[PDB]
Amino acid sequence: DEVKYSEEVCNEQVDLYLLVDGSGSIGYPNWITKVIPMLNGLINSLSLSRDTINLYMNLFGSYTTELIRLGSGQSIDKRQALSKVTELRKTYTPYGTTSMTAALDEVQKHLNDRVNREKAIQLVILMTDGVPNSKYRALEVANKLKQRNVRLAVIGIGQGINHQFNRLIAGCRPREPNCKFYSYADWNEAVALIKPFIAKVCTEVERVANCGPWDPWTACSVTCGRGTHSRSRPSLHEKCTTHMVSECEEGECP
Numbered sequence: 001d002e003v004k005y006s007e008e009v010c011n012e013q014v015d016l017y018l019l020v021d022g023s024g025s026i027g028y029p030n031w032i033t034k035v036i037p038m039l040n041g042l043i044n045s046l047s048l049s050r051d052t053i054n055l056y057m058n059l060f061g062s063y064t065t066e067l068i069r070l071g072s073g074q075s076i077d078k079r080q081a082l083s084k085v086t087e088l089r090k091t092y093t094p095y096g097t098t099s100m101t102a103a104l105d106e107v108q109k110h111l112n113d114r115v116n117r118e119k120a121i122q123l124v125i126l127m128t129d130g131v132p133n134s135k136y137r138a139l140e141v142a143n144k145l146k147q148r149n150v151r152l153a154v155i156g157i158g159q160g161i162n163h164q165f166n167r168l169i170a171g172c173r174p175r176e177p178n179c180k181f182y183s184y185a186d187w188n189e190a191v192a193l194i195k196p197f198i199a200k201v202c203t204e205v206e207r208v209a210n211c212g213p214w215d216p217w218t219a220c221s222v223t224c225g226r227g228t229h230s231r232s233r234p235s236l237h238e239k240c241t242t243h244m245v246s247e248c249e250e251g252e253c254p
């Protein structure tokens with residue numbers, strides 16, 4: 001048989017992969033005056049914690065650079081994540097080519113390795129001017145991510161933004177105003193864009209678990225008159241009953 005039980009589903013767990021374009025096309029003035037404050041405002045709006053949002057962060061240029069791993073201090077504490085952005089303002093100048101496909105591939109690898117949290121919403125935030133090393137290769141991996149139920153939002157940054165590509169990889173429809181997946185204004189709009197994707201919403205649902213077949217009932221405790229016997233089974237789930245006791249009769253007692 002099976003067991004039924006109640007449960008609240010809130011979708012509070014989110015693995016958020018922040019992929020930041022650090023390539024030479026971005027432009028140094030833009031980096032300082034626009035990208036850094038974008039990162040600051042965005043990350044400041046994320047209530048990171050062990051049990052809810054966990055941040056991953058990658059910087060992609062000629063190489064991809066994994067800045068923050070899911071689960072670490074910097075993944076779950078907003079203040080620590082902000083320090084990484086500050087470290088970037090002080091010590092990184094954008095240069096080189098644009099490994100966008102490889103950055104997205106790092107997310108794929110998380111899923112493949114089963115490093116993400118299974119019950120966690122998977123959310124990629126791609127921050128780019130939308131001029132990757134290869135347009136087809138980057139669209140391809142993004143589409144692979146979406147077919148795995150990964151959500152993807154795009155934030156345009158840089159001195160020379162290819163909106164057409166950004167809208168395409170975000171999945172924006174033509175003739176449709178205010179795409180819910182792409183923003184290219186300031187941090188305020190990006191934050192609003194990201195909000196519906198990470199909103200905790202609580203519903204009460206019923207759940208079903210297969211408890212597996214019972215073992216045979218034991219022989220009666222007494223071989224005459226009233227007694228009891230029991231049947232057990234492996235716990236295939238936390239909510240599954242594993243033991244029963246019933247009253248049995250083995251005829252009369254002389």
Ligand SMILES: *[C@@H]1O[C@@H](C)[C@@H](O)[C@@H](O[C@@H]2O[C@H](CO)[C@@H](O)[C@H](O)[C@H]2O)[C@@H]1O
Pocket residue numbers: 221222223224225253
């Ligand atoms: C199994 O075989 C039965 C035919 C009886 O001989 C049982 O013995 C009886 O057990 C009851 C209750 O357990 C006692 O009150 C009796 O004293 C005893 O004869 C036996 O278990």
Ligand SMILES: [Cl-]
Pocket residue numbers: 098099100101102132133134135137138
């Ligand atoms: Cl690429």
Ligand SMILES: [Mn+2]
Pocket residue numbers: 023024025026096097098131132
């Ligand atoms: Mn570039």
